[PDB]
């Protein structure tokens, strides 16, 4: 049926499980260090002579 | 109120230019 | 050791009024609700509880031509007025805050303490503010004070708040009604000679809005900042802590700082911080924004023409009230230009 008013024909619905979908961080956490991006790079300069 | 004298003269052309 | 002879070309285009640079978004404090005295006569006497709530007001961006801006701000208090007040009973004669430019003491006469002509001379002198008791304005964050032509004398100490009690020394004088004076002058003179004239201030205007003159006095509960500055005590007035200045649409010219971060070695006392804000500056200049002085005698006459062409009175919702009328355009002003 086009609707969900819980009618006669509506008693026939069948359902399947939602498709599995894992979520987690990347291997070795390769997303969150901004490597080799000149827009904003890290700095390991000396404190005095920058 | 305020009562001015008989010949008080405001210096604005008043009635007409 | 290598040195560079830096040369920079800059070109910008900033709207006169915008959210950035704080040229918009000023803040004021107006009447919010006027309660009725229960068990008391209603129209016979209207004294009762009043409330005041601080509000922050906003202006549409890009409205140049400071004649508009002073007008647009007025339009905003009227917007707020409308909503809040109408719903809560505040009178329309009690807007509280209004931006004007007239010299309300121009036609004043010392003997009668009344404005003799009967109209406030519509010639613009300088932008100022008109404040009812218990209301005030703020310009701590917004830079509209520079546009308003008001600058604080000791700038650094914080807070540019203007309050009704602060403008002590200048009150807008009432207006002599022309017919009553002329009737007495003609009647008394003709009758006495062939066979003491009295002066009465105007209680209210034609539409019924009340000038709320001080009972027993020729003044009104409207303190003009311009009047306090000039016609007032230099120590007990705004002359002590407020300085008059020429309004400029540019709202000042801040400095821009040019930083190239990875080319020029950092100057003496700068350290390499990759913060978005902080970078080692290399040079400083004024913004390309600048104000050009413009002048034309027929400023007031041109203003009336715009009223007909615009075909709307959103900017002149109170033509009847003289002290609430549309402020006059300034004869000499500025227009921002980008070089």
Based on C-alpha coordinates, what's the Rg of chain C?
25
Q: Of C70, C78, C105, C67, which is closest to residue C222 (Cα–Cα)? A: C105
Handedness of CA C281, C282, C284, C285 (dihedral sign): negative
Rounded-to-integer distance, Cα C10 and Cα C70, Å: 31
* Chain A residues near residue C272 by CB distance under 8 angstroms: 43, 45, 50
Which site among C262, C274, C277, C279 would you substitute to test the A interface, given the most A Cβ atoms closer than 10 Å to its Cβ?
C274
The total of other beta-carbon atoms located within 10 Å of residue C146's CB is 18
The total of other beta-carbon atoms located within 10 Å of residue C182's CB is 13
* DSSP structure string for C273-337: ---SS-----EEEE-SEEEEEEE-STHHHHHHHHHHHHT--TT-S-SS-STTSPPPPPSEEEEEE
Q: Which residues contact C257 (CB under 8 A, 6 or more apart)?
A: C281, C283, C284
The total of other beta-carbon atoms located within 10 Å of residue C73's CB is 25
Handedness of CA C105, C107, C112, C118 (dihedral sign): negative
* Chain A residues near residue C266 by CB distance under 8 angstroms: 50
Length of chain C: 339
Cβ A11 vs Cβ A3: under 8 Å: no
Q: Which residues contact C103 (CB under 8 A, 6 or more apart)?
A: C120, C121, C123, C125, C226, C227
Angle at C28 between CA C27 and CA C29, to 5 degrees: 140
Rounded-to-integer distance, Cα C50 and Cα C212, Å: 16
Rounded-to-integer distance, Cα C118 and Cα C177, Å: 6
């Amino acid at each position: 049926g086009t609707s969900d008013n819980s009618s006669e024909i509506n008693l026939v619905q069948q359902s399947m499980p939602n498709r599995p979908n894992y979520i987690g961080f990347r291997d070795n956490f390769v997303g969150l260090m901004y490597y080799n991006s000149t827009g904003n790079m890290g700095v390991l300069a000396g404190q005095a002579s920058q | 109120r305020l009562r001015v004298e008989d010949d008080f003269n405001p210096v604005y052309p008043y009635g007409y230019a | 050791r290598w040195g560079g002879d830096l040369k920079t070309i800059l070109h910008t285009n900033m709207p006169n009024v915008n959210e950035y640079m704080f040229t918009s978004k000023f803040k004021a404090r107006v009447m919010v609700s006027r309660k009725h005295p229960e068990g008391v006569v209603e129209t016979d006497l209207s004294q009762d509880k009043l409330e005041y709530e601080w509000f922050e007001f906003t202006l549409p961006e890009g409205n140049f031509s400071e004649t508009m801006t002073i007008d647009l701000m007025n339009n905003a208090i009227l917007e707020n007025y409308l909503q809040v007040g109408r719903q809560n009973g505040v009178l329309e004669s009690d807007i509280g805050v209004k931006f004007d430019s007239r010299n309300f003491k121009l036609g004043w006469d010392p003997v009668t303490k009344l404005v003799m002509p009967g109209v406030y001379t519509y010639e613009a002198f300088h932008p100022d503010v008109v404040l009812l008791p218990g209301c005030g304005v703020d310009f701590t964050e917004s830079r509209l004070s520079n546009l308003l032509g008001i600058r604080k004398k000791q700038p650094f100490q914080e807070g540019f708040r203007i309050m009704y009690e602060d403008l002590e020394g200048g009150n807008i004088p009432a207006l002599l009604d022309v017919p009553k004076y002329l009737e007495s002058k003609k009647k008394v003179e003709d009758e006495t000679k062939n066979a003491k004239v009295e002066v009465l201030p105007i209680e209210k205007d034609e539409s019924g809005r009340s000038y709320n003159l001080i009972q027993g006095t020729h003044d009104t509960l409207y303190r003009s900042w311009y009047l306090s500055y000039t016609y007032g005590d230099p120590e007990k007035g705004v002359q002590s802590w407020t300085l008059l200045t020429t309004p400029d649409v540019t709202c000042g010219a801040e400095q821009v700082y040019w930083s190239l971060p990875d080319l020029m070695q950092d100057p003496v006392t700068f350290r390499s911080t990759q913060q978005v804000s902080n970078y080692p500056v290399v040079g400083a200049e004024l913004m390309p924004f600048r104000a050009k002085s413009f002048y034309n005698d027929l400023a007031v006459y041109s203003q009336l023409i715009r009223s007909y062409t615009s075909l709307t009175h959103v900017f002149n919702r109170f033509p009847d009230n003289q002290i609430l009328c549309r402020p006059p355009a300034p004869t000499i002003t500025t227009v921002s230009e980008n070089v």
